[PDB]
Design a protein around this ligand. Structure first.
Ligand SMILES: NC(=O)c1ccc[n+]([C@@H]2O[C@H](COP(=O)([O-])OP(=O)(O)OC[C@H]3O[C@@H](n4cnc5c(N)ncnc54)[C@H](O)[C@@H]3O)[C@@H](O)[C@H]2O)c1
Ligand SMILES: NC(=O)c1ccc[n+]([C@@H]2O[C@H](COP(=O)([O-])OP(=O)(O)OC[C@H]3O[C@@H](n4cnc5c(N)ncnc54)[C@H](O)[C@@H]3O)[C@@H](O)[C@H]2O)c1
Ligand SMILES: NC(=O)c1ccc[n+]([C@@H]2O[C@H](COP(=O)([O-])OP(=O)(O)OC[C@H]3O[C@@H](n4cnc5c(N)ncnc54)[C@H](O)[C@@H]3O)[C@@H](O)[C@H]2O)c1
Ligand SMILES: NC(=O)c1ccc[n+]([C@@H]2O[C@H](COP(=O)([O-])OP(=O)(O)OC[C@H]3O[C@@H](n4cnc5c(N)ncnc54)[C@H](O)[C@@H]3O)[C@@H](O)[C@H]2O)c1
Lengths: 247, 247, 247, 247
């Protein structure tokens, strides 16, 4: 019902798509939710669509300074997050021969290093506040599938899974758990506006289950991972893709 | 709310340990729970302990006739299951050199074949009633770890995972999902009664978080897998072990 | 010759298909090869195809007595195996609704329990002769894919993988390693003669590299696993399928 | 033995440890080997040590210009590589609270981005010649274990695995395969000089097999992956750790 009442959750990349849906679900669970995105206008719209439980604070997760200020404002408002959802990422469609060093560095910088910058500051905030926290990072089932046209992205998401596995070991002693979710193809705004939108016919045929994946399919799983019901799960990756791959 | 209100769930091996806790949790969730176990007296006491939401029906999962009777009665009383939790198993402690054909067959027959027998009848019942269904099978993280002193058991639990993956593919078109859970070492009645009770020191040493795993640790995850929140998950395995291994 | 010179390798189910190709390759590697199969005449033909390094001994891997005689004969011929290749299995094509308990037991009985019977006697033979040993079991990438029309088979192969992981733990102390190979679809005598033959179009599309898999593709990896180059590998599963799934 | 006659292989980070051992083994297989390292003097000594067809060319894998120079010289000397082994990396020991952005960026930059830089150039070279190549990247079993005191490293190596899985898909059409190897703790010169050297006691106890892993244990597996025996394997990860974890 309101299992998250009295908890504070930060969701990055929450202006639209999966992050917005995650933010909305955690608010419905009762959490105070910080809606954060590099898109300030989008973050405000998202927090407004969710209601009084949500506040928009813009941040670029690849900018250490931006992240510092984000967490400072959160500390001032709430006394510190209990839940971190690392959702922000660029989701590119780049043919392998167009994957040059500039592109590679860009994706690694945001998707992987940004995830570290945010996790560093966030779990540090959890520990300072004596809170038994939950870190939930959004990876991708492309890591299992080896999906084409996103080579740097697949590398980055593999980095996120590796990071999650190491982090669980490092933070268990502080009563913090770290888990990852690997969504399959999801009909988010970002995917709808991308060449990946064209993959739905193929992917749906490969799924065990019918229909296009929706942001809510992922949000509802993250809800579980943020709850006390998942307290014995740490260092794990949960795959949510209607059966496209098996993990 | 009580999210499982109006739903019927069958939990096998529910007289004690993880099974009883699963049954208790699903009832708390608002389900009508069929508490089934080969131990008829134990099944009765478990259902009594849980409340009016719970009904005991004894069954030997390795016995096709026993299982048929089980499901015939459930059909008569409820109109058919919505949720199947395959929990029943023998959990041995047997040195490799003592793993003979007789032992091997016994473990496979109950833990793997029994699981097929129940799932065959159970999913047929769902389909006949035209119900969206959820099949949740309890495996073991020994499949990932390669734990000694339980070779036949590890083999059988691998089979449960394999069966789960194939089942998800076969049943998705009928709106039935199938997932597995791999508990780590749990302080259940059965474990407390075996040499596995002495393995907690070594196991806790390997966990990211300290403490002995409890039946409720598993029950709470099964609750999630039984719910609408897990609807986009099928063919997957969720490892619940305080980080002893990483899946 | 060269590298397995002096070594004795037992290959079960080696009258045709992958088993035959494995036997041929290990002979080429220099091992004395025991070609075993339930089809006594097929085993004799397969040995003759290989030459002086092969002896045929009929055996039904699911029959404890037959396996016992098999190993007694091998001990006399060679002084005991150094290498066990568990290749025998039934590869069915069976729609889910046709998977009944009789079919399930048959598949489990041969593919999983037979695998146990042979490995029990084989590894016991290794230890009695004080030989370092190598156990290599052929599973299937269907365990990873959740391939339809073979539910009991996928369960059994999941069993073989779990057994492998446990066995590695049990036997390492005796300097015996145990690994598994998961072939993708292979154009073997058996597959040629079954409805799986029609799966090449779909499988090839999923492969990173094109072409129908051949028995030699598997035989050449088994060769590696049988050799000293693999000496630091135990408890592992090597997937050989031109990239249909990623392990 | 001479199975790589006529083939050219590049091994990065080959001045010592696993890299030098890999270089030595491929040379023994008959390949023309380019021994590359950032340690220019060490690379020279290692190539001269190996003799046979080995030549040294210094390069920093994280420096795009350095790598371009490396490959230009290889092309001039040999007509281009057939085999790429991505072995160079930094192996840190850093407590979590000492993992800051500078440390993180450096480990990602060399271990993950350096791997991309070299692979980009190396596979472009393969394709320019129309060769059916082999990419083999050395990851780490720390990705499976979530090992402490190397959070950025574990993330980087997960990235290498992800990269490998995507690359296999991208280059299959050009008949190039891409696989990864995950060594366990190995007694390389680097490790002997690291605080990681102190983990041997615990690790050997967790292994199914006895003894400290050696560079040769890894070199002999890479030899296999570079050969035609591995031709049907792509997108895969082979774990080589005497059974410390199970993959
Ligand atoms: N949609 C899918 O098919 C799918 C599949 C697998 C994984 N994912 C993952 O789910 C998450 C969300 O994906 P989505 O489809 O909702 O994407 P989306 O494009 O719809 O939304 C991504 C959001 O992240 C924000 N963002 C980008 N860079 C940022 C940065 N530097 N700092 C802060 N915010 C930034 C964008 O502004 C955008 O609002 C991502 O981690 C993505 O990799 C998505
Ligand atoms: N306890 C653990 O450390 C652990 C770890 C991983 C997985 N598991 C799994 O959890 C499940 C429950 O384990 P537990 O520790 O609670 O066991 P337990 O011994 O405490 O309870 C097992 C129950 O199963 C019943 N049972 C045995 N054979 C049966 C059959 N033929 N038909 C019907 N019921 C039968 C027993 O009567 C008993 O009531 C099993 O699947 C087990 O493999 C347990
Ligand atoms: N061919 C494929 O696409 C494929 C894919 C993945 C795994 N596999 C595995 O490879 C192995 C060989 O497959 P194949 O395609 O060559 O099969 P096949 O049908 O061509 O040959 C199987 C052999 O096993 C023998 N056999 C059956 N039951 C036996 C028993 N009870 N005792 C002794 N021998 C018995 C048969 O007589 C036959 O000679 C099997 O383990 C199979 O599961 C095959
Ligand atoms: N030794 C282990 O226990 C272990 C375990 C798992 C994986 N690995 C991996 O094996 C590989 C080799 O490890 P090792 O133990 O032999 O290391 P090592 O330290 O002994 O040798 C590494 C070599 O890489 C070179 N190098 C470092 N940075 C470079 C760069 N910028 N460009 C080019 N060369 C560079 C060094 O000069 C050194 O010669 C690494 O990828 C490592 O991550 C090692």
């Amino acid at each position: 019902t309101e299992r998250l009442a009295g908890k504070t959750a930060l969701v990055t990349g929450a202006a639209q798509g999966i992050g917005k849906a995650i933010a909305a679900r955690l608010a419905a669970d009762g959490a105070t939710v910080i809606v954060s995105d590099i898109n300030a206008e989008g973050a405000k719209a998202a927090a407004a669509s969710i209601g009084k439980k949500a506040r928009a604070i813009a941040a670029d997760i690849s900018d250490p300074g931006s992240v510092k200020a984000l967490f400072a404002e959160i500390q001032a408002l709430t006394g510190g997050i209990d839940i971190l959802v690392n959702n922000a990422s660029i989701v590119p469609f780049v043919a392998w021969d167009d994957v040059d060093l500039d592109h590679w560095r860009k994706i690694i910088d945001v998707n992987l290093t940004g995830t570290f910058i945010v996790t560093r500051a966030g779990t540090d905030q959890m520990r300072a506040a004596g809170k038994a926290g939950r870190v939930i990072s959004i990876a991708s089932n492309t890591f299992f599938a080896g999906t084409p046209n996103m080579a740097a992205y697949v590398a980055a998401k593999g980095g996120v899974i590796g990071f999650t596995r190491a982090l669980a070991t490092e933070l268990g002693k502080y009563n913090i758990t770290a888990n990852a979710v690997t969504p399959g193809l999801i009909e988010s705004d970002g995917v709808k506006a991308s060449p990946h939108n064209e993959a739905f016919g193929f992917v749906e045929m490969l799924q065990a289950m019918k229909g296009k994946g929706q942001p809510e399919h992922i949000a509802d799983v993250v809800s579980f991972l943020a709850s006390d019901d998942a307290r014995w799960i740490t260092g794990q990756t949960l795959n949510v893709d209607a059966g496209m791959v098996r993990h």
